[PDB]
Structure formats: structure tokens, C-alpha cells
Amino acid sequence: RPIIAFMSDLGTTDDSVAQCKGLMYSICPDVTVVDVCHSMTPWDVEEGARYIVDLPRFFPEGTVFATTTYPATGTTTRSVAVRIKQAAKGGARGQWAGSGAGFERAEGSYIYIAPNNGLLTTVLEEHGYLEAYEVTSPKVIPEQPEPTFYGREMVAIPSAHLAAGFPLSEVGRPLEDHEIVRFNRPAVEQDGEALVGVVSAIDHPFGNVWTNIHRTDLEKAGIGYGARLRLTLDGVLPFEAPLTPTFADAGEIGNIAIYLNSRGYLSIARNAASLAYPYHLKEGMSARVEA
Amino acid sequence: RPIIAFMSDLGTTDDSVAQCKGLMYSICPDVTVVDVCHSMTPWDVEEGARYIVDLPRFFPEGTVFATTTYPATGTTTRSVAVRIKQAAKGGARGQWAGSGAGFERAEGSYIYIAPNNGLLTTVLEEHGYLEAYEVTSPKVIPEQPEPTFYGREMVAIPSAHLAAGFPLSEVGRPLEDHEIVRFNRPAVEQDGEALVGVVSAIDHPFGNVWTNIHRTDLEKAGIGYGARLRLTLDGVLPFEAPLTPTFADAGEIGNIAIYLNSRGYLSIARNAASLAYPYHLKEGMSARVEA
Amino acid sequence: RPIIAFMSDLGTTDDSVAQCKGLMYSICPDVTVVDVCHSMTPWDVEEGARYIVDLPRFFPEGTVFATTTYPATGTTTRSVAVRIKQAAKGGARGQWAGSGAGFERAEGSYIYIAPNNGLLTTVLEEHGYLEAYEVTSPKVIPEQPEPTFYGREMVAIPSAHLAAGFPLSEVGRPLEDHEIVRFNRPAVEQDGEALVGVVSAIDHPFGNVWTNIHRTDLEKAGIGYGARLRLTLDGVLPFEAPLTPTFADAGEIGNIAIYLNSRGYLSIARNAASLAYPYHLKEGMSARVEA
Amino acid sequence: RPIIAFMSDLGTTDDSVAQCKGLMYSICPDVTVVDVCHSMTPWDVEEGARYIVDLPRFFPEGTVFATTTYPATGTTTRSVAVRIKQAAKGGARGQWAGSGAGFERAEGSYIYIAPNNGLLTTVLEEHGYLEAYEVTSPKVIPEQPEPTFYGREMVAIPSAHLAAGFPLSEVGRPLEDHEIVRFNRPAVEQDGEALVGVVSAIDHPFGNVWTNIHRTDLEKAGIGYGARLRLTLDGVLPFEAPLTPTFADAGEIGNIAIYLNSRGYLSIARNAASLAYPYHLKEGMSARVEA
Amino acid sequence: RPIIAFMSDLGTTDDSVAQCKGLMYSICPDVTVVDVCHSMTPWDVEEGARYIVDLPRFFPEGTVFATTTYPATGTTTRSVAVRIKQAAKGGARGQWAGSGAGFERAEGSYIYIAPNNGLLTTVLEEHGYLEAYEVTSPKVIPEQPEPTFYGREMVAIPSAHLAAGFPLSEVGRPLEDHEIVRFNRPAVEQDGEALVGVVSAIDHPFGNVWTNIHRTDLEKAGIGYGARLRLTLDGVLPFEAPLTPTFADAGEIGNIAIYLNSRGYLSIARNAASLAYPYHLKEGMSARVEA
Amino acid sequence: RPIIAFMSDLGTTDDSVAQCKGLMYSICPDVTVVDVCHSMTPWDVEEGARYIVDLPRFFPEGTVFATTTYPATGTTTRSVAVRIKQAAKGGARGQWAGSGAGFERAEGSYIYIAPNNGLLTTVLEEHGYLEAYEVTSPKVIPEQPEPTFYGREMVAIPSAHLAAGFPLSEVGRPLEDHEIVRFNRPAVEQDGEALVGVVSAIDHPFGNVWTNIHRTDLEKAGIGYGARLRLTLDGVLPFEAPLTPTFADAGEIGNIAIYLNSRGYLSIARNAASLAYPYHLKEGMSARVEA
Numbered sequence A, B, C, D, E, F: 001r002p003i004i005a006f007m008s009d010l011g012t013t014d015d016s017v018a019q020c021k022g023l024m025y026s027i028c029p030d031v032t033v034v035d036v037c038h039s040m041t042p043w044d045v046e047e048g049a050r051y052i053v054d055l056p057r058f059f060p061e062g063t064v065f066a067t068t069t070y071p072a073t074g075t076t077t078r079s080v081a082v083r084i085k086q087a088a089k090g091g092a093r094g095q096w097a098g099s100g101a102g103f104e105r106a107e108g109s110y111i112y113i114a115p116n117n118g119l120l121t122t123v124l125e126e127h128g129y130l131e132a133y134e135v136t137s138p139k140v141i142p143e144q145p146e147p148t149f150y151g152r153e154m155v156a157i158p159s160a161h162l163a164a165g166f167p168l169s170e171v172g173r174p175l176e177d178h179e180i181v182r183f184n185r186p187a188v189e190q191d192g193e194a195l196v197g198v199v200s201a202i203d204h205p206f207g208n209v210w211t212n213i214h215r216t217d218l219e220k221a222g223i224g225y226g227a228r229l230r231l232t233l234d235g236v237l238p239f240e241a242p243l244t245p246t247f248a249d250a251g252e253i254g255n256i257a258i259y260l261n262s263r264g265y266l267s268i269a270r271n272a273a274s275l276a277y278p279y280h281l282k283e284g285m286s287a288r289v290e291a
Ligand SMILES: C[S@@+](CC[C@H](N)C(=O)[O-])C[C@H]1O[C@@H](n2cnc3c(N)ncnc32)[C@H](O)[C@@H]1O
Pocket: B009, B010, B014, B016, B042, B043, B068, B069, B070, B071, B072, B073, B148, B149, B150, B151, C203, C204, C206, C208, C247, C248, C261, C262, C263, C269, C270, C271, C272, C273, C274
């Protein structure tokens, strides 16, 4: 039966996540709580967004995503709960997840609940939504919420009510689209025949380097598997390799691989060695690619 | 059905916790195991105590708390199993947890099982207890326990029998109050109009600063929300701010907030910035407060 | 209910493990997923092996072990799925796990599923096996597997089918013994009457030192409890103590203990203090022992 | 005998400084070379300036100051050689250096030779000058200067000729005042009645904190010895103490002292303990002071 | 002609030492200033003492030792100036320094000038003294000394007057023996046949380990070259080697050597490898030796 | 008059270098001791060689180079003293050092004294020699040398006698060429049109990267200033730039410069930024260059 997938900035160094889970099991006795991750940089909504955007196609229909970083905790702000539209295919190629031909997911089958602070920006961009509500009903949140713990009060608790079958439309008033806070997503720019983006993430624990340059950005340049690329990082450290599906395509252990990661984005790595860690490469460094 | 909430010093870098879990599912097939945390400083009973004392009000009645750091592993020592009295309200204000008016918890509704080494000191202080037993019966522990793994043998295994409905009074003989080991809890001193305590913890991953000065100590001084405080850390850092419910009350990002944390304790932080990390503030540093 | 115990190198800093879990619940709705650990050094098959070899006796019969580090992801390689023979006793002494006299486990009661890259080397050595198959059927893996995520495609997904009762023999063709990749396990040598091995691991979070010198290597050498030992580490740092069952046997806090760990191997520690961390002792350092 | 006092960014990890010295003795055999320091942050002209501005009153008349960080090495740029006017009193109080009443120094008694890159900015501001020349004559520099070693070619070599009595006016053409490159010296601001500046330096090896708030800024603001001050660092860390002449005035070891350093600037310290190091205080952090 | 050997806690990261030197050349134009070292832990008089006690036999007669760490700077304290008695033999064996049979040094041939804070404790112990004066005359120190720079005002400046031939007896009044401040030197204990001391120092940059167990303590036990020793560090590291004159006597590179250092003290090292650095051995650790 | 340039592995954290200097002034009262450097990695003869090979052309004729790392201290080995032949031009271009056309140095004008352990390998290679002697005479070394301090006994002391005019041929017997120990100098290899060497050094404090690829190696490939080069480091981090005389030729601050350093070797840097430090580039990394 019901699943809550829980992504927070609470860490795993104290009992904070367990407090939320205790309440989730209290409210929805049959629930399964799946940890997404609790290690994001606090208050970094763009990073939290990366951990939650790709999730729906992996989960059983009816799954509730409880997703929180809440620096405006204790203020008059209230969470947003949305039923997304498209589960959405994903991966380097763009497909359903699972055995055989994959598991097709029906539309309108997932709910996200989150602070209304832009955390859901890319979820809404990539999946769309069918309905959105402000979370205000004392049936689903505390009458006297703990000031410093709104992720528990305004996300974990109401997520468990939704998992327990509390009607989404009863959590509070519908929100107009402009009332849902979004963050600005920096565009990949074309610079002659080059594409210019950033390092979006270091892929821990491996030290692979992920960029914000999407497959679609490459397809738009006619760059496909086999293309010899020059990928320049930090505007000083350059790299040369063909675009390949995987790490082993580089040949010898330690050789440079340029590939599409499992999220659909242009990435660079060493084959069975860490690229990022020895050279201290970091998120936010410039990333330029050209054939 | 049954829940075991599991707090240990085992970490999550090998299969130790999984070994305990396997045995829990072996003994109580329908159990749900909830991780509290496994990252405590080993052998620091005062720190372990902080991760378990606030738990009961969050959990369904009948939950068993399996809580362990066991430096006396492999000796003639035996664990203690206690049925607590008051589930106890908590928070900055002192309330039940949950939506609406919160979930009131019945008395005598939770069991803790732990080494008899002081780990349960504050649990017993804040909740009281109705009965306490030494854990000795070969029905609930190994006849030949692994010398170096008493958290598994003397806590995890018998917790699962308890969760499965093994009668608490049958784990072994009743313990008199003086036979339950306690650690000394240093008091918050009165020093004129001031209060003198310590930094109890750095609140990871945020770098908030928690003190052992409780709301009840503040009340003794008549310090309420709105009072302008000087909070001096480490003897030399006279921070000045009013006592506010939350971080955002400090105004601009990075401004100092003095507040009551979600555990009921006087704390200090910066608004959506880390206080402790840039200046390497630490547990054990002195903390003085005055109006 | 069915259990999957999941060991990977995916870490816990993003949604990787949760994607695997989502698919596990999709395929086998009544499953319980137990995390073994996700923190292993990527691509270190010998380390991964250490985290999985001791598991079976702790788990209910029918448990599926999904175990992966997959540096050959996206290649023509296919996973191996084996039903092990002996659940196998373990510990410092060699016993069944659990309360009373322990829980005996029937033969042929556990499946491991893993990359065919040597990860299962010690599992097969210590437990033996009844049957082994290559994992190829589109009924249990994707027809179009994600190139960079074979742990999910070729381990997590099929493990969930096996947990749901998919016949093991139907995953693909039987593998001959020589077709199952092994790593070389470096032997404990004798230099005269000294036993010469290595530091196999630092036991986090404690800083205990584990060697690859097993109880049986000691028995062959005529060393039992009470024997005064000289244990030399890194060909530099000497330590002297009798062989004892546990840490507290050393007397005062900080005193050296030489002992058999819970996995059955010669180890060294300080009593309730860290040995490894102050001296920066490491996995791979030489370890020599003599009576 | 002639003295060259030598300040560079060359460090002391190779033979760089010794190459300069060899040439100094070659050109001026009776010279004494005094190391000022060689550890400055490379290319940080403001830091280099701090190490040289206070020197003249300490040295015998006729001393040549050879002072260099040379990031424009190998370009068409040429060094500037100046004879300063006032030797200038210094210290917390403003006095001549030395025993008795100190050693008065005659005007026009010192030469500085440096890259024309702003290094001499504060030297000229605090001392003034009588004459300034561009260093171009092949009598005092190489006809074929080493491209990457202009500190040696254009500072060390000519300084040795000047020490040996080569007429200053013969090194090259006179420079007009506007032709001498200056850096902007960021002013101490007033925010109401608070003086607002920066941490100018960490005083190694002690971990004292130096600000750019000078004795005269204090005098203008009506602050003298005995005044109770609140000094805030990094817009976060507050400290409170009276202004005192020295560290021991703070009382117990570890107590906060706010003082005028030996260069005449407002500074903060712990009495015989490091302030900066435990709190990781740094150059460039804001510093605010108020009575 | 005259030599001042200068040891301070001033470091070499700014112009502090250069300021002292300028004043030395100002007062005594023909002086040679020799840096002893400037890198001592500030305020650690025992460490400063180790850098100056072995000096006299290496220097020409008439050398002045200017030696300073001055945490009491700016108080009513005044330096002490002493003419030592015995230049004293030194080394592992106890000999004069130099070629041939060494350079015998006359008695009463060296002056030390230092804060009266215990810095000269071991100088006076090992050399004795013939006369001692408080440094007060405005002929040799500033009438208005810089409060925060007493090493310059009360040591460097008067050292230069002394080097210039200013009569020692004229610096101020004679001091009685009890007026010369000393630090306590912990003894090397006899413990059965064993000797119990400490690690006095890590010998940088090699990472050799020096003890406070002197050749004369070894002689008391009849421990000579060739004796097989157990040297235990930090309480738990029973190193075993014969006492040898030098490192290479240990044989293979990396082997343990136990030796008498160039200062006369029992020490331990590896042959052409670092002992202290890999295992983070430290000053203050216990050191026990027995045959 | 006489100069001794002193290069050792003694560091500057204690009085070791000062002990040697004391003796140098004792033996040769008129001497000037110039520090080359004391910070080399102990026992690394190849590194020590780099700090001393380029020195002669900078120093007055008659200069004695006292150069030591002595891991065979206390053994029967004895130092070598050589009169070199060619002073040798140097730099990126190959010229005399100094003002005007530079200072031409006569042949046979410099002596090196060093352990006979290969330290002088490159000195002898680049300068040649006219005579070489084993240093054994009790007129120039101690009759009873300190076992652990042969750099003082067998280098510093006899260097001072040579500076004082002791006849070189009287220090001991002449050495045949094969009796002078040399280290192996790895060749730069041609790999098609590429040159393959190593990173010889990180140029501290700047973080420039120096290779063992000489100007002559470039001239041999017809690579001159202006040539577009691809310089690959560590076999993964590549770089592209024209060969230029200096850093500023790169344009903007932070741009990659490929140049000939002041020692004559192909090097790579960022313009007024550190290359090595952010990417943790190190000595011993591969360096490949191609036009
Ligand atoms: C050794 S740990 C068990 C997990 C370990 N990774 C293993 O596989 O054996 C078990 C218990 O021993 C205690 N322990 C661990 N190291 C210890 C030490 N050096 N001294 C005393 N107790 C220790 C811990 O607090 C814990 O309660």
C-alpha cells in the first residue's frame, strides 16, 4: 500500500528524520517511508530540486513525495501540494524505468508536497501539474506548529495524511500558477558552435562531473555518440574524448570518458577512477563543449 | 503493527546495523524498524541520551526503543528494559506532536531497552518509569553472546522479542531504582540575574548552536519572547539579540537569531547562514545568558 | 514477507538508492528493503565482499541479497544470480546468530545477485552454492538498460522479481564454475613462526584495527585466549597484549586490547578509545603476529 | 657599511633569494643584506606595502630598500627608484625608535626601489619623496633582462648599484607624480557613530587581529585609553573590552584585549592565547568599533 | 668583530625581525646578526630554552645571545642580562665543537639577554653564571618603550649596545639569584630498572623523536651503545632496537634506530624515513626506556 | 671578502643552521654566510641538486658552496670537495647574470663541498670540474665527528676552512671520476613529434608548474616562441597556449601561459593566478608537449 518518499535537509546525525517518520507511521499505519536523501546543502533549493525531479517514473502510482528545505520555517508561509501531470520518461535516452519495456505510469498519479519556496520548480517544468493547493487545514497540519521545524509540521505530517487518503483538494485553497514560487534556471548558451553551461554537480562518491548541458542541447547541435568533443572546465582545464554511452568505452582504467549520465546530461569522468577529487573540481565551475 | 526505533553507535559504513535488522525481522516478521540514528560519538552516553529522550510523543503507542552504545560489551553486565510512564509533551512550547491539537499519548505506552550504563538517564528523568527489568532470560538473548557485539545480542535481539509480544516482566528480575546506572547532569547555574550553562550540541547540518539552558530556566528569570539578551559563548562572544520564535525573525540573511529550539532549549544561530561552522564553535563551550 | 538486503556503492548523497527502492516496491509490493550499506569505496570488490559475506545467518530464509559495485556498467556483461548452499555459522567462536542457542538456517535458503566481477568471491568460498545463472531474461531486466546504472538495471530490478517469486532458473542460462569471476584472496604467510597478513579494515566509527588473520590461522599456529602476543603494524608500530575476548579485558580505558572480532578475525584496539585515528592507521598496512 | 633591506614574494623554498644576494655582493662587496621578509602573498601589493612602510626609522641613514612583487615581469614596464623625504615616527604613540629618546633620522636619507605597480603607495603617502626616477640605465640593470625574474633584474641588481654609490639621478629619467602607480586605499567609514573598517592582517604567529582603524581615526571619534569598546568582526562575532596599551592589561590568560598595535592601529587579541586561529578569523573580514 | 645571535617568537611572515635588525646595525654598525630561529611556539619558554642552551660552544667568544619570547610585554617587568660561566661541552659524547680536537671556549665569554620569565632556566643550569643584571638604563633601552614590542625594546636594542662594548654592569642593578625567574624542569624518573620521561620534541623536518632522557641518565642505568632497549612511547608502543650512534646502523631504510641525538639525548627514528609524521607522534607523549 | 653559500635539509625550526654558522664565523672571521635554502625534502638528492646547480654565475669568484643532505651521517663515508670548471651561463636564453652585458665569471672560480651521495650530479654535468678530493684531514673536519650531524661536521666546518684559504688539495686524497657518486637523470623522450618528461617541481609560492623539458629539447624540435603547444599533465589534464617569454603574454589574469622559466625549462602557469594549487598538481606528474 501507500509510500511516502522523503527528501530533506535534516541530515542523519540526530533523531530529526526519525521524529518525522514516527508521525508518518502514526498518521498512516500501513505506510512505507522511503528515504530519498537527507544530505543536501541546507537552503539550496536548486540542489534539492535535482534530488526529486527524476523520481516519479521509478515509484508505484499513488506515491507521495515529501520534499523539504525550509529556511522560512516559523513564518506565515505555507506549503504547496501538487498533483503532477506527466510521470515523464528519463535517462540518457528517454524511456520508462523497469524490466522489459519498462513500467508505463499513468498521468496524475503522483503528489509532491513542499515549502512554497521554489523547490518544485523543475518538477513542475518537467512533469506539469493538474492541481495545486496551499496547505492550511488544521486537519493536515498542526494548529500550533513548531516554529523551527516546518519540514515536519508543514510537509511530513500533511504528506502522511495524503498517503492515508485525505482528499488533496481539502488541504487548503487552490493556488494560481503565479502564486507558486519558482527559481530562475540559467540557460545553456550557444557561443559560436560551442555550448556554454556549468558544472551542475559532482557525482559522489565517484567524482564524476555533471553539467547542465542536456541531451536535447547536444541533439540540437547534431552532437551524437561518436563525436569528438572538447570539453573545457573552469575555463582552464580542457579535455578531449568522443561522446560515449559509458565509462568503459574510454579503454584503460583512468582514461577520460565523456558521456550522457543516467539523468540525460552531458558529463565527464575517468574510467574507474575519480576525476573530480584529485583536481578538486567543483559544482559551479564553467563547462564549455564543442565538436 | 509493531515498531522498533533503533539508535546505535554502529555507524553506517559496514553491515553492522543490517545484522541487527536481519535478526529483528527473524524474530518479529511484521516489525517495522525505524532508524533513529547511528552516528553518535561512540561511548558518549550523554549524546546518545539526547537522541532518544524526545522520541516517545512522535511514535505510535507500543513502540519499542532499542538504544545502544555498549563499551562494556562482553562483560557480565546486562541490559535494562523499562516501561516509561509519561510519553511527555515537548517542543519550544510544550505540546503534543501531530496535526490538529496533536496526538495525546497514553501513559505506560513505550519500552526502552538499553545497556545499563546511564544511556537512559534523561529518559527516566523526563518520562519516569513504571517498571524496570534486567535482561537475562535465554528466551530473549543468546546463551552464548558475541563478546564484542552486545548492542546486537543484548539490545537488538531482545527488542524484537518485546516487539513480538514477549512479556516485559519475563526478560529477567526487577531492578531497584539504585541499580539503574545514571550519569550526572550538570545544572544550569544562577549567577546574579544571569544563567550559566554550556553549548550542549552543534545542530548539524546547519551549524546552529544549542545550549543546555531550557525554556523552564528562562521562565525562572522571566525571560520571554521579545527580551533583549546578551548571550556570551566561549567566555568572550557577547551576542546580542531579542529572543524570537524562529530564524527569519532576525531579518536579513546572516543576522543573529536567539531562539527556543524544537527541543525546548535556548539556542543561537544566523538566519539562513551557519553560525558554528565559520568560527568553529563547539559543544562544551561556555554559554551565559542575561537580559 | 519477502526481504531484499541491498548493498551498493551508490552512497547516500542523492536519490540513486531511492530510485532502486522505488522499482523494488513497484515489482514486489509486499517487500521489505533492508539497507546493508552504500558507503563502500567505489569499484573495490574486496571491500564490498566483506560487507556481504557474513549476512545470511542473520536473515530470515528466502532473503535476497542485492549486492553491487558495477564499474563495467553499460558493457555486454551480465549479472550472476546464485543460490548459496550453507548459511554458515560465524563470529569470534563460530555459532548460529540469535537468542537461546541461535537460529539454525536451512541450506539453499538465500540468493545473491551481483555483477559478475568477483564481488561474490568470498560468499561462494564461505557458503558454497547450489545453482548459478546469468541474468539475461527481459522478464527480469530492462530490454534497454540504462548504460551508466547497471546496479539498478541488472541487480536491483531482478532482485525484486526474485523476491516476488520469479523462478531463479528462469533468469538466464546456467553458468559453469569457471564463468564466475573471482578475485585473488592474498594468503596469510608465515615468516618463521610469525603470522604475516594485512590490515583488512579500520572498524569505523571506533578506530579498531581488523586484520585478515583468522581464528583458524591462529589455531594452526598454536595461539589461543591468554597468549601474550606481539602485533606489529605497518612494519613499524609495535603493540603487545594477551589475546582476550573483548575490549574491557584490557583494564583501564585506553589500554591495548588484542582480540577476535565479531567476524572471527584477529583485531587490535584501545579499550573505549580510538587506536586507528590518532596514529592514522590504515587498511593495507602490514600486520604481523607472534606468541 | 651600506645596507640593502630586501622584501620579496620569492619565498624561501628554493635558491631565488640567494641568486639576488649573490648579485648584491658581486656589485657591492661591503654590503650587508637584511631580509625583511619573503613570504608575502604573491602579487598582493597592499600586503607587500604593509611590510615596508614602517621600516625607515629603524635603519641607519643611507639604507636602500629593495622591495618587489613583480607580476608584470618581462613586460616593457620599468622599476621606480625614489628618495623618500620624512623617515617618519611610528608606533602606537608616534615616536622615534631606539634607546633613550630614540634615534632621529635626517630627511632624504632612504631610497626605495620597486616595480612601478603601486607597491610604494603607502611609503609615498606616509613619507613623501624628494625625487623619483624610472630605472632604465644599462649601468644598473641587464641589457637583456630575464623575462620571468624582474625582481632580480630590475630591483635587486639596481639596489646594489645604489648601495655602492651609483648616483640615483643617473638610473633613468625623472618621473612625474602621476606616472607613479598607486593603489586605492579603502577608507575607514562611519556608520552613525561606529567606525567601520576591515581586518588588515592576522598577526602571525600569535593570531592577533589587526584592523585598518588607525589611532587618528579613534582620536577623531573621541576614543582614548580606558574607553569601553564594542568591536564586531565579520559582521558576526562581537567582542567587548576597554582600550588598553598591551595584552597583559586584560588580566587572566585568554581574556580579550583591545589595543593599539606597534604600527599604530586598533587591534584585538587574547592575552597569551591565539584569538584568530581557534575562530578562523581572516584578513578582509569587516571590523566595526564603537564606544 | 661583534656577533649577536638572535632567537625570537616573531616568525618570518612580516617585518618584525627586520625592525630589530635595523636597530642592531644602527647601534653597532660592525655587528653580524645571526638568526638562531624565529619559529618557536609563542610564549613556550621551555621550547625557546631548548633552542638557546646548546649555542655557546659553536660561537666565537664575546658573542651576545639576544633571546626572546615576551608575553609580559608592556608591563613593569625588565629583562635580565647574564654573563655565563662555562661555555660547556655538548653532543652525544660531550665534546668541544669544531675541526681537530674542537675549539675550547674560555669561561665568562658569552652574554645572554632575555625577558626575566624563565627563558634562561637551562642556560643557567648547564652553564652557570658569573653576574646578572636587570636591564633598566635609558642608555640601553627606550625611555618610552613600545608596549607591545618588548623583545625589540628590552632585548634587541640592549643586545646591540652590549655588542658595541657597553659595560654589562652598567645596564642596571645586580640581580640576586632568587630574582631570576625559573621554570620547573621535570626529572627523568627511576622506575625499577626503567627510565620514565617524555617526548621533548619532534625533530623537524625529519620526524625524529627526541626524549628528555639524557646520556647521563642512561649512564646511571649502565645503558651504553649495543644495549637492546625497549622504548615505549605514548604508553602503548614498545619499540625494540639496540642503542646505536646513528641512523644507518639500523640497516635497511625505514628500520627503527634508537640513538643519542646531537644534543646528548635518547632519541628514536627510522633510517632515512620519518617516524613521527606517519603516526602523528607528538611532544609531551610519555617515553619509557628499559634494557 | 669570503662567501659561503649554504644549502641544507636542516630547516629553520631550530638552532641547527645557527650551530653551523657559529662554527663558520669561528673558523673564518671575515666570512659572509648566504643562505641558499634549508627547506628541501630531506634525503631527496635530486631536489637538493636543483637548488644548487644554477648558483655559480650569480656569486663572486672564490665563493664556496656548502651543500648538504646527509642520510649516511655517522658512517665511514666522507664528503667530496670539487673545484668546478665552467661557471656556466643560464636563464631562459643562456646568458651571464647582472647589469649591462652581465658578469663574466672566470673558469675554476668556485668550490662545492657536499656529501659524496650524488648531490653534485648536475653541478658536475653542467659545470664540469678541475679537481676533486675526499674530505678527510683532521685540519678541516672533527677528529671525533658527531654521528648524527655530518652536514655540520663534514660540510659546514670544512667549507669555512676552504673560505679561510685552506688549500683545497690538502683536504684529503684526490678522487677518481668513478668514485664520485651520481644519480640517474631520466631522459626526455621523443614520442612521435611529442616530447615526454615529468613535472620537475611546483614553483612555490606561485604554483607555477616546471618540467624537465629543456630549451635545448625544444630547439631540437624547432619549437620556438610563438609555437602553439599542447601541454598535457598527469596524462589527463591537457592545456593549449603559444610558447611565450612571460606570464603577462597570456592576456587576462588567470589565462594559461606556457613559457621558459628562469632556469631554461619549459613551464606552465596562469597569469597572476596559481595553476598548481587549485588543481593539486604535483612534482612527478607526467608532462607531454607537442606543437
Ligand atoms: C565492535 S561494535 C560491533 C560492530 C563492528 N563493526 C563489528 O562488526 O564487530 C560493538 C560494540 O562494541 C563497542 N565498541 C566498539 N569498539 C570498542 C572499543 N574499542 N572499546 C570498547 N567498546 C567498543 C561499541 O560501542 C558497540 O557497542
